[PDB]
Design a protein around this ligand. Sequence first.
Ligand SMILES: [Zn+2]
Ligand SMILES: [Zn+2]
Ligand SMILES: [Zn+2]
Lengths: 31, 31, 31
Amino acid sequence: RMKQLEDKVEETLSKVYHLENEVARLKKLVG
Amino acid sequence: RMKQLEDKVEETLSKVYHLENEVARLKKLVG
Amino acid sequence: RMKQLEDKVEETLSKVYHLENEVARLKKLVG
Ligand SMILES: [Zn+2]
Ligand SMILES: [Zn+2]
Ligand SMILES: [Zn+2]
């Protein structure tokens, strides 16, 4: 469960970093 | 504590999934 | 191990809440 938990958390965090970049891109587009 | 953590991680995943959908709709709107 | 995992989950949820706020602010700027 632990490694499975850690794996899911790492995955999620990477999903989050990605969304941060997307949001950064969007802010620049709208200005 | 492990079960509370796993539930928390699931809930976080659900919030992230919703965020992706919001960002996706935004990218469609602004281009 | 669990503690550092809890820390990473809390840091991830903090980024999520922030992103939700950015998304709400974009949505008001777009349509
Ligand atoms: Zn994306
Ligand atoms: Zn939303
Ligand atoms: Zn921000």
